[PDB]
Amino acid sequence: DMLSLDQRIQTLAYEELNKAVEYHQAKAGTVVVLDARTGEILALANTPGGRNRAVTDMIEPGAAIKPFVIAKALDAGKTDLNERLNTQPYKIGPSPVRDTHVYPSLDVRGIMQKSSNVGTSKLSARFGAEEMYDFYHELGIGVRMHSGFPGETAGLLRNWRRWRPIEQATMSFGYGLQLSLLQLARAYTALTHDGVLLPLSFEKQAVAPQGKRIFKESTAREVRNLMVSVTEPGGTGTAGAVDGFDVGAKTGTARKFVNGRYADNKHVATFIGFAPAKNPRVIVAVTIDEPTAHGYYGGVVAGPPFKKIMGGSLNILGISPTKPLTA
Numbered sequence: 001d002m003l004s005l006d007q008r009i010q011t012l013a014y015e016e017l018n019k020a021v022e023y024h025q026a027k028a029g030t031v032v033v034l035d036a037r038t039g040e041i042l043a044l045a046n047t048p049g050g051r052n053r054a055v056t057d058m059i060e061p062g063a064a065i066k067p068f069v070i071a072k073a074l075d076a077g078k079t080d081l082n083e084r085l086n087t088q089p090y091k092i093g094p095s096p097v098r099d100t101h102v103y104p105s106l107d108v109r110g111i112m113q114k115s116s117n118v119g120t121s122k123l124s125a126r127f128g129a130e131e132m133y134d135f136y137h138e139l140g141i142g143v144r145m146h147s148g149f150p151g152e153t154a155g156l157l158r159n160w161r162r163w164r165p166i167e168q169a170t171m172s173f174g175y176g177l178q179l180s181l182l183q184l185a186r187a188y189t190a191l192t193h194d195g196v197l198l199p200l201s202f203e204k205q206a207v208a209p210q211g212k213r214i215f216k217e218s219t220a221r222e223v224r225n226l227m228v229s230v231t232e233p234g235g236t237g238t239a240g241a242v243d244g245f246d247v248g249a250k251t252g253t254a255r256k257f258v259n260g261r262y263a264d265n266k267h268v269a270t271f272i273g274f275a276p277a278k279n280p281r282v283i284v285a286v287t288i289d290e291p292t293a294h295g296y297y298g299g300v301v302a303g304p305p306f307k308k309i310m311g312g313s314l315n316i317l318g319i320s321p322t323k324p325l326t327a
């Protein structure tokens with residue numbers, strides 16, 4: 001049998017996912033676990049029972065898309081690692097562009113670490129609309145996965161000719177475009193596989209299949225290091241840190257679109273990360289739908305199951321820790 005599924009990881013993922021969903025009294029949840037070098041899908045878990053939401057359900061990614069805007073800006077030389085960007089909030093007409101805190105300025109590392117919508121939108125604004133549209137398209141947004149499961153759709157990437165000026169701003173921190181958790185996890189292979197986006201596979205891969213280069217290898221390596229700051233003190237994703245490893249991750253918290261408004265009530269909490277951060281072996285992605293108890297942010301809600309799924313996955317795959325254990 002040549003199937004990529006690993007039953008121990010799949011069982012680990014399902015149990016931790018259901019604990020998190022129950023503890024936060026959430027409506028639903030999904031997990032994807034990938035081989036970070038080949039794109040093999042090691043686990044897909046969904047709750048409550050029924051359809052494969054990891055493949056079928058399109059979500060807005062929120063700040064989980066920010067790593068790719070930051071990488072693109074660095075890759076194209078439109079920013080660097082020492083620029084400090086004014087990150088004061090502002091508005092375009094009625095629409096605000098603001099962070100949860102007012103940071104007067106941040107470098108690119110701070111934009112990632114703090115999850116600055118303002119910083120990301122200003123980096124994105126250095127590109128034209130059609131450029132960015134093509135960029136989201138080559139990340140696979142709007143491109144069907146052909147996983148073999150029914151109910152799968154391509155996702156949403158609106159035509160660039162219809163973008164209002166505010167739209168390109170808000171798309172850069174995860175508004176307006178839609179993708180499945182599988183498409184989102186797939187995009188993170190461009191960061192783990194040294195700039196090369198992988199197709200993903202449900203069968204064991206003897207080699208890493210031929211991918212498509214999105215970023216230079218140096219860009220991917222620098223961005224992975226920025227993402228380690230997310231799980232260290234000062235970042236939004238400390239709940240996902242794993243003993244004996246450096247973890248690059250990104251949190252996301254998206255207001256749900258109820259009828260015709262973005263609810264300040266209901267949220268989707270996402271945590272996606274990879275380890276070992278220098279030479280990744282595993283990607284773990286977790287999305288918790290509408291938590292109602294014990295917090296609703298991505299770090300607090302989906303961070304804890306990420307940490308237990310990642311740590312156990314590395315243990316199951318025999319990945320040696322890169323630094324002394326302290327737990």
Ligand SMILES: CO/N=C(\C(=O)N[C@@H]1C(=O)N2C(C(=O)O)=C(CSc3nc(=O)c(=O)[nH]n3C)CS[C@H]12)c1csc(N)n1
Nearest residue numbers: 060062063100115174175251252253254255297298299300
């Ligand atoms: C509620 O805001 N709605 C947004 C949006 O701007 N989301 C951004 C995003 O991904 N965010 C994240 C985060 O990184 O988790 C955060 C997390 S900050 C945080 N994390 C904790 O774990 C914690 O205990 N406390 N705090 C303060 C701010 S909302 C923002 C949105 C984007 S698309 C969409 N439909 N909604």
Ligand SMILES: [Cl-]
Nearest residue numbers: 208209210211
């Ligand atoms: Cl490859």
